[PDB]
């Protein structure tokens, strides 16, 4: 079972590393051909053939430093969405290789380190460690059910083995080792109470909508502990023991001005984002602070940020009510409340890092208003399993009482494109407000099996455009409060188009149609009309719509170039 286990993982690295060196370099500079190679020496024939036929289509590389890469895939596919059906092949002076895991991701990275003109040996650690993690993850879950991540919101959080698909170390997190992963792992069904402080209440920075200052504090801990002028903030245990040994809390702890209780908040399961936790039947997901490096972020929130978090989510109160009629159906999960704390005097640049440290953010828990057997992560929902194929196909089975044909399929997609092209083009277009709808920050909602809402999330990521989403901005606002929510409709734009097309539904017809790409084309094709009919259902110009329409290119943000130095690429229209 290790071994296998082992084994599931590599395959799992080596492919999401294929997705970045399709995506983000191949493609974009021609280096890619679908034919055979001249000499095949070094192959076996099971490789490329079935017994009845090739299996599938030859993918060619040939890497400007004279490597070469070999490997079967499915499909044609102009933003690199492909079932890879062989190990993979490399050459070099003549003469065809299998090489381990660890010599090849080296050996391919090398490729890309010499595209690049730049070296990160910082990065092959972290991809070793990667899939080392998952190594971990499917040898724990590895007994059961394929589609159990499927059955359950929370589950569906905890069940994203491999992450994100397109990147090259998707698992790579950097604690102080002597902490460990599994503590922390959603992957592990990582449970913890949340670490707690008293604080007085002066020192504190409230943000509410519909909420009470107390409320928000009630959100986030229990307030009985609290003697008078004071209050109770919770954290991310790893985040308060690096929180601690700062001296300035150190001090603070001495002069008995706050106190360390201990893990005594509230018992919470964190989500596939790590530092956002969940409490079942509790009103709210707790949101904190992880000065943690995590798939190249830390994960920290600053003071601007706390505090647009709160103008995001008044702004989709407004819109929801006096303008439900242009938002294409939206269903987004509220923000509702904000915390940090800063010892009253400290002085602006303590006062910044004081809150950015114990800043959290209360996020309504949609699975009261939405049921947590009803609510699945977009992420796992078109991730694969711990047998490597995708849990939709067996998922839909078990609710459509048989397995679903081709119609069956096309009409599920359908139904489930249109609630997310429609929420977020509407919100765009109409309001200028960007948002970020990839698979972690989408949640479906679905009745026995069939796509009623596509929840989105996460206000940290939402933007305002410069020439329409600025004016529900008010010039009351601090300029870098304004500044962080800024963006140009370039950018807006370049941003939903990685997000919508090749992060989000690329990877649903990539899931949807496994072991059938005839349907690939379809699902697409479907994607353009669906397109059309949102455009004539706008009130304002569209102009970047037309474009994508006629099939100009579309935006890609890399994920392993951006590493190696160059953040978005150029992906050929699917029409």
């Given at each position: 079972?290790?071994v ?13 590393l294929?997705?970045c060196?399709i995506?983000?370099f ?19 024939p ?18 400007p430093?004279?490597?070469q ?8 596919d ?8 062989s190990d ?17 991701v ?5 490729a890309?380190?010499h595209?690049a ?15 080392r993690?998952?190594?971990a ?14 059955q ?9 083995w491999?992450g ?14 002597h ?8 992957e592990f ?10 604080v ?9 909508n ?15 502990p609290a003697?008078?002028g004071?209050?109770?903030?919770c ?5 308060a ?13 001495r ?11 509230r ?6 984002s790590?530092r ?10 707790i949101?904190g602070?992880?000065?943690?490096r995590?798939?190249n972020?830390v ?10 978090t ?5 702004l989709?109160?407004q819109?929801?009510d ?7 159906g ?11 704390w ?37 992420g ?7 047998d ?44 200028g ?10 949640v479906?909602?679905?009745q ?7 929840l989105?999330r ?7 455009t410069?020439?329409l ?16 929510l800024?963006?140009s ?9 990685y997000?919508?097309?090749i ?21 697409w ?12 259902e706008?009130?304002q110009?569209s102009?970047?719509?037309d474009?994508?329409?006629?099939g ?5 943000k890399t ?17």
């Amino acid at each position: 079972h290790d071994v296998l286990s082992r084994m599931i993982s590599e395959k799992a690295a080596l492919h999401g590393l294929l997705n970045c060196l399709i995506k983000e370099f191949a493609i974009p500079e021609g280096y890619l051909r679908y034919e055979w190679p001249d000499e095949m020496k070094g192959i076996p024939p099971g490789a490329y053939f079935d017994g009845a036929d090739w299996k599938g289509i030859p993918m060619m590389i040939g890497l400007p430093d004279q490597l070469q890469l070999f490997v079967m895939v499915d499909r044609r596919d102009t933003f690199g969405s492909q079932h890879y059906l062989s190990d993979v092949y490399l050459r070099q002076a003549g003469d065809w290789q299998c090489p381990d895991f660890e010599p090849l991701v080296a050996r391919l990275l090398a490729a890309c380190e010499h595209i690049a003109g730049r070296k990160n040996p910082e990065l092959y650690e972290q991809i070793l460690q990667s899939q080392r993690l998952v190594s971990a993850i499917v040898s724990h879950n590895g007994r059961q059910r394929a589609d159990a991540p499927l059955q359950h919101y929370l589950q569906s959080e905890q069940g994203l083995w491999f992450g994100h698909p397109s990147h090259p170390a998707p698992k790579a997190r950097l604690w102080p080792a002597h902490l460990g992963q599994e503590q922390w792992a959603p992957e592990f069904q990582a449970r913890a109470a949340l670490h707690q402080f008293e604080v007085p209440v002066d020192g504190l920075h409230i943000g509410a909508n519909g909420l009470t200052p107390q409320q928000v504090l009630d959100g986030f801990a229990d307030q009985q502990p609290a003697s008078p002028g004071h209050a109770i903030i919770c954290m991310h245990p790893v985040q308060a023991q690096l929180f601690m040994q700062d001296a300035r809390v150190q001090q603070l702890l001495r002069d008995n001005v706050i106190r360390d209780l201990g893990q005594s908040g509230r018992v919470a399961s964190p989500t596939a984002s790590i530092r956002t936790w969940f409490i079942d039947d509790h009103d709210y997901f707790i949101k904190g602070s992880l000065n943690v490096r995590i798939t190249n972020c830390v994960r920290k929130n600053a003071w601007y940020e706390l505090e647009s978090t709160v103008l995001i989510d008044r702004l989709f109160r407004q819109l929801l009510d006096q303008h439900a009629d242009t938002l294409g159906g939206l269903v987004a999960a509220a923000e509702p409340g904000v915390v940090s704390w800063s010892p009253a005097a400290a002085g602006e640049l303590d006062s910044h890092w004081f809150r950015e440290q114990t800043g959290g953010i209360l996020r309504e828990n949609f699975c009261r208003r939405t049921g947590a057997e009803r609510s699945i992560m977009a992420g796992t929902l078109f991730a694969r399993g711990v047998d490597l194929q995708p849990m939709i196909q067996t998922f839909l089975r078990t609710h459509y009482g048989e397995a679903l044909d081709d119609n069956a399929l096309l009409y599920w997609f359908d139904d489930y494109q249109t609630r997310l092209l429609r929420p977020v083009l509407s919100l765009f277009f109409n309001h200028g407000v960007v948002m970020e709808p990839h698979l972690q920050n989408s949640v479906l909602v679905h009745q026995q099996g069939r796509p009623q809402q596509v929840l989105l999330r996460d206000f940290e990521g939402v933007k305002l455009t410069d020439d329409l989403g600025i004016r529900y901005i008010d010039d009351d606002i601090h300029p870098r409060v304004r500044q962080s929510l800024l963006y140009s409709r370039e950018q807006g734009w370049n941003r939903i188009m990685y997000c919508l097309f090749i992060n989000h539904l690329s990877e649903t017809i990539l899931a949807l149609s496994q072991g059938r790409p005839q349907l690939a084309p379809l699902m697409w094709r479907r994607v353009q009309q669906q397109l059309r009919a949102i455009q004539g259902e706008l009130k304002q110009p569209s102009p970047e719509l037309d474009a994508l329409i006629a099939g100009h290119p579309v935006a890609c943000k890399t994920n392993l170039k951006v590493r190696l130095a160059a953040s978005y690429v150029r992906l050929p229209s699917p029409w």
